[PDB]
PDB file of C-alpha atoms in Angstrom:
ATOM      1  CA  UNK I   1     102.657 108.748  82.930  1.00  0.00           C
ATOM      2  CA  UNK I   2     103.888 106.333  85.600  1.00  0.00           C
ATOM      3  CA  UNK I   3     106.166 108.344  87.904  1.00  0.00           C
ATOM      4  CA  UNK I   4     109.239 107.087  89.649  1.00  0.00           C
ATOM      5  CA  UNK I   5     109.252 107.538  93.457  1.00  0.00           C
ATOM      6  CA  UNK I   6     111.943 110.243  93.557  1.00  0.00           C
ATOM      7  CA  UNK I   7     110.657 111.880  90.390  1.00  0.00           C
ATOM      8  CA  UNK I   8     107.191 112.271  91.962  1.00  0.00           C
ATOM      9  CA  UNK I   9     108.611 113.538  95.280  1.00  0.00           C
ATOM     10  CA  UNK I  10     110.494 116.231  93.365  1.00  0.00           C
ATOM     11  CA  UNK I  11     107.458 117.370  91.352  1.00  0.00           C
ATOM     12  CA  UNK I  12     105.204 117.484  94.489  1.00  0.00           C
ATOM     13  CA  UNK I  13     107.879 119.504  96.327  1.00  0.00           C
ATOM     14  CA  UNK I  14     108.036 122.009  93.467  1.00  0.00           C
ATOM     15  CA  UNK I  15     104.254 122.338  93.531  1.00  0.00           C
ATOM     16  CA  UNK I  16     104.238 123.174  97.284  1.00  0.00           C
ATOM     17  CA  UNK I  17     103.120 119.906  98.872  1.00  0.00           C
ATOM     18  CA  UNK I  18     106.030 119.334 101.397  1.00  0.00           C
ATOM     19  CA  UNK I  19     104.516 120.173 104.777  1.00  0.00           C
ATOM     20  CA  UNK I  20     101.361 121.637 103.148  1.00  0.00           C
ATOM     21  CA  UNK I  21      98.885 121.830 106.069  1.00  0.00           C
ATOM     22  CA  UNK I  22     101.524 120.101 108.181  1.00  0.00           C
ATOM     23  CA  UNK I  23     101.836 116.919 106.021  1.00  0.00           C
ATOM     24  CA  UNK I  24     105.410 116.192 105.099  1.00  0.00           C
ATOM     25  CA  UNK I  25     106.302 115.075 101.581  1.00  0.00           C
ATOM     26  CA  UNK I  26     106.639 111.348 102.472  1.00  0.00           C
ATOM     27  CA  UNK I  27     102.877 111.369 103.346  1.00  0.00           C
ATOM     28  CA  UNK I  28     101.949 112.614  99.860  1.00  0.00           C
ATOM     29  CA  UNK I  29     104.260 110.119  98.070  1.00  0.00           C
ATOM     30  CA  UNK I  30     102.952 107.237 100.219  1.00  0.00           C
ATOM     31  CA  UNK I  31      99.324 108.275  99.418  1.00  0.00           C
ATOM     32  CA  UNK I  32     100.044 108.420  95.659  1.00  0.00           C
ATOM     33  CA  UNK I  33     101.791 104.987  95.858  1.00  0.00           C
ATOM     34  CA  UNK I  34      98.866 103.203  97.326  1.00  0.00           C
ATOM     35  CA  UNK I  35      96.151 105.186  95.589  1.00  0.00           C
ATOM     36  CA  UNK I  36      97.377 104.870  91.996  1.00  0.00           C
ATOM     37  CA  UNK I  37     100.751 103.098  92.048  1.00  0.00           C
ATOM     38  CA  UNK I  38     102.111 106.485  90.764  1.00  0.00           C
ATOM     39  CA  UNK I  39     100.115 106.214  87.532  1.00  0.00           C
ATOM     40  CA  UNK I  40      98.485 109.541  86.382  1.00  0.00           C
ATOM     41  CA  UNK I  41      95.960 107.624  84.242  1.00  0.00           C
ATOM     42  CA  UNK I  42      94.456 105.460  87.058  1.00  0.00           C
ATOM     43  CA  UNK I  43      90.677 105.485  87.343  1.00  0.00           C
ATOM     44  CA  UNK I  44      88.369 103.431  89.596  1.00  0.00           C
ATOM     45  CA  UNK I  45      84.573 103.311  89.687  1.00  0.00           C
ATOM     46  CA  UNK I  46      82.851 103.394  93.075  1.00  0.00           C
ATOM     47  CA  UNK I  47      79.566 101.621  94.022  1.00  0.00           C
ATOM     48  CA  UNK I  48      77.674 104.946  94.281  1.00  0.00           C
ATOM     49  CA  UNK I  49      78.466 105.571  90.520  1.00  0.00           C
ATOM     50  CA  UNK I  50      81.187 108.238  91.124  1.00  0.00           C
ATOM     51  CA  UNK I  51      84.775 107.564  89.839  1.00  0.00           C
ATOM     52  CA  UNK I  52      88.211 108.330  91.327  1.00  0.00           C
ATOM     53  CA  UNK I  53      90.791 109.922  89.028  1.00  0.00           C
ATOM     54  CA  UNK I  54      94.507 110.260  88.702  1.00  0.00           C
ATOM     55  CA  UNK I  55      97.568 109.956  90.884  1.00  0.00           C
ATOM     56  CA  UNK I  56      95.679 110.870  94.036  1.00  0.00           C
ATOM     57  CA  UNK I  57      92.336 109.311  92.964  1.00  0.00           C
ATOM     58  CA  UNK I  58      90.189 112.384  93.398  1.00  0.00           C
ATOM     59  CA  UNK I  59      86.477 111.612  93.488  1.00  0.00           C
ATOM     60  CA  UNK I  60      83.856 112.930  91.058  1.00  0.00           C
ATOM     61  CA  UNK I  61      80.996 113.222  93.591  1.00  0.00           C
ATOM     62  CA  UNK I  62      82.591 116.306  95.169  1.00  0.00           C
ATOM     63  CA  UNK I  63      85.668 117.508  93.362  1.00  0.00           C
ATOM     64  CA  UNK I  64      85.583 117.349  89.587  1.00  0.00           C
ATOM     65  CA  UNK I  65      83.082 117.054  86.776  1.00  0.00           C
ATOM     66  CA  UNK I  66      82.980 113.935  84.641  1.00  0.00           C
ATOM     67  CA  UNK I  67      79.462 114.344  83.253  1.00  0.00           C
ATOM     68  CA  UNK I  68      78.133 111.090  84.657  1.00  0.00           C
ATOM     69  CA  UNK I  69      77.901 111.441  88.476  1.00  0.00           C
ATOM     70  CA  UNK I  70      74.301 112.801  88.896  1.00  0.00           C
ATOM     71  CA  UNK I  71      73.937 115.471  91.535  1.00  0.00           C
ATOM     72  CA  UNK I  72      77.693 115.886  92.178  1.00  0.00           C
ATOM     73  CA  UNK I  73      79.607 119.102  93.033  1.00  0.00           C
ATOM     74  CA  UNK I  74      82.689 120.219  91.151  1.00  0.00           C
ATOM     75  CA  UNK I  75      84.549 121.959  93.973  1.00  0.00           C
ATOM     76  CA  UNK I  76      87.965 122.097  92.199  1.00  0.00           C
ATOM     77  CA  UNK I  77      86.302 123.579  89.066  1.00  0.00           C
ATOM     78  CA  UNK I  78      87.819 121.112  86.659  1.00  0.00           C
ATOM     79  CA  UNK I  79      86.831 118.251  84.324  1.00  0.00           C
ATOM     80  CA  UNK I  80      87.930 114.975  85.875  1.00  0.00           C
ATOM     81  CA  UNK I  81      90.023 114.203  82.723  1.00  0.00           C
ATOM     82  CA  UNK I  82      92.322 117.105  83.702  1.00  0.00           C
ATOM     83  CA  UNK I  83      93.439 114.955  86.680  1.00  0.00           C
ATOM     84  CA  UNK I  84      94.785 112.246  84.379  1.00  0.00           C
ATOM     85  CA  UNK I  85      97.441 114.405  82.740  1.00  0.00           C
ATOM     86  CA  UNK I  86     101.193 113.758  82.903  1.00  0.00           C
ATOM     87  CA  UNK I  87     101.392 117.292  84.393  1.00  0.00           C
ATOM     88  CA  UNK I  88     100.305 116.873  88.024  1.00  0.00           C
ATOM     89  CA  UNK I  89      99.463 120.594  88.585  1.00  0.00           C
ATOM     90  CA  UNK I  90      95.650 120.120  88.500  1.00  0.00           C
ATOM     91  CA  UNK I  91      95.785 117.115  90.823  1.00  0.00           C
ATOM     92  CA  UNK I  92      98.064 118.987  93.263  1.00  0.00           C
ATOM     93  CA  UNK I  93      95.926 122.137  93.285  1.00  0.00           C
ATOM     94  CA  UNK I  94      92.716 120.141  93.909  1.00  0.00           C
ATOM     95  CA  UNK I  95      94.439 117.946  96.597  1.00  0.00           C
ATOM     96  CA  UNK I  96      95.317 121.190  98.469  1.00  0.00           C
ATOM     97  CA  UNK I  97      91.580 122.103  98.631  1.00  0.00           C
ATOM     98  CA  UNK I  98      90.672 118.559  99.769  1.00  0.00           C
ATOM     99  CA  UNK I  99      93.265 118.330 102.590  1.00  0.00           C
ATOM    100  CA  UNK I 100      92.114 121.747 103.816  1.00  0.00           C
ATOM    101  CA  UNK I 101      88.471 120.593 104.058  1.00  0.00           C
ATOM    102  CA  UNK I 102      88.526 119.608 107.734  1.00  0.00           C
ATOM    103  CA  UNK I 103      89.625 115.957 107.851  1.00  0.00           C
ATOM    104  CA  UNK I 104      93.194 116.463 106.618  1.00  0.00           C
ATOM    105  CA  UNK I 105      94.637 113.495 104.697  1.00  0.00           C
ATOM    106  CA  UNK I 106      92.047 111.043 106.143  1.00  0.00           C
ATOM    107  CA  UNK I 107      90.108 112.022 102.985  1.00  0.00           C
ATOM    108  CA  UNK I 108      92.324 109.397 101.214  1.00  0.00           C
ATOM    109  CA  UNK I 109      91.382 105.936 102.464  1.00  0.00           C
ATOM    110  CA  UNK I 110      94.678 104.353 101.416  1.00  0.00           C
ATOM    111  CA  UNK I 111      96.631 107.047 103.320  1.00  0.00           C
ATOM    112  CA  UNK I 112      94.581 106.384 106.440  1.00  0.00           C
ATOM    113  CA  UNK I 113      94.944 102.619 106.201  1.00  0.00           C
ATOM    114  CA  UNK I 114      98.511 102.269 104.879  1.00  0.00           C
ATOM    115  CA  UNK I 115     100.501 105.405 105.476  1.00  0.00           C
ATOM    116  CA  UNK I 116      99.142 107.068 108.650  1.00  0.00           C
ATOM    117  CA  UNK I 117     101.362 106.336 111.637  1.00  0.00           C
ATOM    118  CA  UNK I 118     104.090 104.681 109.559  1.00  0.00           C
ATOM    119  CA  UNK I 119     107.615 105.849 108.826  1.00  0.00           C
ATOM    120  CA  UNK I 120     106.535 107.851 105.731  1.00  0.00           C
ATOM    121  CA  UNK I 121     110.040 109.343 105.582  1.00  0.00           C
ATOM    122  CA  UNK I 122     111.158 106.098 103.927  1.00  0.00           C
ATOM    123  CA  UNK I 123     109.230 107.195 100.811  1.00  0.00           C
ATOM    124  CA  UNK I 124     111.621 110.015 100.055  1.00  0.00           C
ATOM    125  CA  UNK I 125     114.902 108.506 101.299  1.00  0.00           C
ATOM    126  CA  UNK I 126     117.653 108.490  98.731  1.00  0.00           C
ATOM    127  CA  UNK I 127     115.971 111.207  96.591  1.00  0.00           C
ATOM    128  CA  UNK I 128     118.043 114.276  95.685  1.00  0.00           C
ATOM    129  CA  UNK I 129     115.443 116.893  96.707  1.00  0.00           C
TER     130      UNK I 129
END
């Protein structure tokens, strides 16, 4: 499913992401925008052989099992395919474990390079939340 901007903001809010670990909702919508262009089915292969999955491009070396990243952990206890669903619950629940890991949202390279320090509030303006 390719989410609309306000549609995604509303689903992330319902799932507890607004201000989760101090990151307001615009940060999460901005990160999803640049990580997957709001597409739940996005996948990208990395040079080390791991793959990033779903709306927030969660990586298979640490967070999910895809059966082809040798020697990887599965810290969210999920198959990576679960992160490609139209239902974002699995991606949200795993994202909460990642952002709590110590480096906050810097775990998402596109957030760090394209959202951090910007007016992320613009990503939810106009949405009935």
